[PDB]
Amino acid sequence: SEDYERRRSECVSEMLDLEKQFSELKEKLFRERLS
Amino acid sequence: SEDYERRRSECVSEMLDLEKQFSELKEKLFRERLS
Amino acid sequence: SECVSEMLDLEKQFSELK
Amino acid sequence: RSECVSEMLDLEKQFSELKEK
Amino acid sequence: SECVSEMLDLEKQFSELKEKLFRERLS
Amino acid sequence: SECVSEMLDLEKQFSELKEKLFRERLS
Amino acid sequence: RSECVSEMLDLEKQFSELKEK
Amino acid sequence: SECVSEMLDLEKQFSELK
Ligand SMILES: [Cl-]
Ligand SMILES: [Cl-]
């Protein structure tokens, strides 16, 4: 058997994590460029 | 006299605030669309 | 500030939208 | 009636001003 | 109206700048 | 290499989806 | 040598898979 | 998970980039 939704969620959570790192960098660059 | 940099910073801070509201909505929509 | 009062208006409208 | 437009326009210009140079 | 199309115009400018900054800091 | 051009490709897909979602939830 | 490319490709496909339907 | 191990690699490379 395969816990398809558990596995899906672990993958989603990693993508969310990487995308929040990208976003944090974009927000830093935005604030630095305007300040 | 005009505290040009103080005034500039208050304007910048508001723009940062509005843009963080927009970002929070985009992040909510992203997570909901992937989950 | 004009920049600040207008942004506050915009922040309010974005809140109401949501 | 129509700050939406007027305000957007002004804030658009202020944003260009802030990210210049 | 709570300014929707104009709010979109502005958010678009912010997002375009963020994408350009990211690409530049990295490229 | 720490994968830079490929990291940009992916971030671009994420940002494009976020812009589409925002526009849709609001339009 | 080159997971960068291979990994990007796989994760690109996984991202399309996740946002489908 | 393949998705997870690859993402962790990508997260590490993004950290190293910074
Ligand atoms: Cl399992
Ligand atoms: Cl003053």
Q: What is the DSSP letter of A29?
A: H
Query: By CB neighbour count within 10 A (0-12 exposed, 13-18 middle, 19+ buried), where does B21 fall?
Result: middle
How far is the C-alpha of F27 from the C-alpha of G2, rounded, in Å?
42
Question: In 3D, which of E15, B30, F3 has the Cα closest to residue G15?
Answer: B30
Burial of B16 per CB tally in 10 Å (0-12, 13-18, 19+): middle
CA proximity to G18, closest of D1, A13, D4 = A13
> To what resolution in angstroms was this structure determined?
2.0
Neighbouring CB atoms inside 10 A of C9's CB total: 15
Closest CA to D11 of D3, F23, D20: D3
- Which two three-digit tokens encode residue F4? 């830079």
Q: Find chain A residues with C-beta within 8 A of B31's C-beta.
A: 16
Query: If you measure CA to CA, which chain B residue comes closest to C7?
Result: B14
CA A14 – CA H8 distance, rounded (Å): 7
**Separation CA F19–CA D10 (nearest Å):** 23
Question: H18 in helix, strand or coil?
Answer: coil
Q: What is the DSSP letter of A14?
A: H
- Contact criterion met (CB below 8 Å) for B18 and C8: no
Nearest to C2 by CA among D10, E11, E9, E7: D10
Whole-number Å distance between alpha carbons of F5 and F3 = 6
How many Å lie between the alpha carbon of H17 and the closest alpha carbon of chain A? 11
Residue F15: name the closest of B12, B29, D8, G9 by CA.
Answer: B29
- Give partners of E (≥3 CB pairs < 8 A): A, B, C, D, F
Exposure b/e, F1-27, CB count within 10 A at least 16 = b: eebeebbbebbeebbebbbebbeeebe
Structure tokens at A13: 């959570």
The torsion angle over the Cα atoms of residues F10, A6, B27 and F27, rounded to 10 degrees, is 90
Distance CA(F9)–CA(G8), nearest Å, equals 8
In angstroms, what separates the C-alpha of E27 from chain B's closest C-alpha? 24
First to last CA, chain D: 35
Angstrom distance (rounded) from CA B17 to CA C6? 13
Experimental method: X-ray
Rounded CA-CA distance C4/B13 in Å is 9
